[PDB]
């Protein structure tokens, strides 16, 4: 809720887009297709903000 600091947080994913919605649409479709044997979940971070 601080407009001054928001761009710095959005870049580092402390508060902003969720991992499923800032990756390229190709990557997120790729990741869920192969999650059975090769997981790309713990790498990209998803923010949570109170």
């Amino acid at each position: 809720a601080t407009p001054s600091m928001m761009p710095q947080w959005a870049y580092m994913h402390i508060a902003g887009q969720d991992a499923s919605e800032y990756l390229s649409p190709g990557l997120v479709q790729f990741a869920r297709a192969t999650d059975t044997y090769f997981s790309l979940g713990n790498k990209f971070r998803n923010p949570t903000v109170a």
Partner: peptide, 28 residues
């Protein structure tokens, strides 16, 4: 109004858990 402003935001959209807001328990 909308009460989504009170829910934690997991990303950009609020969490907003499903319709588990019930209660039903007894010995049966």
């Amino acid at each position: 109004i909308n009460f989504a402003s009170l829910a934690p935001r997991h990303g950009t959209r609020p969490f907003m858990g499903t319709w588990n807001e019930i209660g039903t328990s007894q010995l049966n």
